[PDB]
Amino acid sequence: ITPGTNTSNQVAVLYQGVNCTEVPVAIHADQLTPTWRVYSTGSNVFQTR
Amino acid sequence: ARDLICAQKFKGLTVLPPLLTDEMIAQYTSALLAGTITSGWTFGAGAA
Numbered sequence A: 001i002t003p004g005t006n007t008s009n010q011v012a013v014l015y016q017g018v019n020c021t022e023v024p025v026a027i028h029a030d031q032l033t034p035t036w037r038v039y040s041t042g043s044n045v046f047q048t049r
Numbered sequence B: 001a002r003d004l005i006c007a008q009k010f011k012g013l014t015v016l017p018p019l020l021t022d023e024m025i026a027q028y029t030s031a032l033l034a035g036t037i038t039s040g041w042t043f044g045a046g047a048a
């Protein structure tokens, strides 16, 4: 959900059609791309439809 | 069982929800109906 490279480098990631509880970002199971991981509590995790 | 949409969800065949919710579409319809009822066709060419 990047707001544009010129404006800022901060980005937001939307995981499509998955409940946040059973698949969060802080799990050490390394759900693909081990180096690619968002911070556990960088921002509040929002669950959308 | 596991329904049919859930079965199709596997094998990488998902469904993207619409951007505009049914409630928002209903609100648009209600606004259009109210404009037509009160202001007639005037609101379609400017202010109501």
Ligand SMILES: *[C@@H]1O[C@H](CO)[C@@H](O)[C@H](O)[C@H]1NC(C)=O
Binding pocket: A006, A007
């Ligand atoms: C971002 O876009 C604005 C709008 O044209 C521009 O003035 C500005 O220079 C751009 N940023 C950079 C770092 O070039």
Ligand SMILES: *[C@@H]1O[C@H](CO)[C@@H](O)[C@H](O)[C@H]1NC(C)=O
Binding pocket: A019, A020, A021, A022, A047
């Ligand atoms: C996600 O899982 C939790 C715990 O199982 C549940 O309480 C919550 O309702 C679920 N959310 C969705 C959107 O299914």
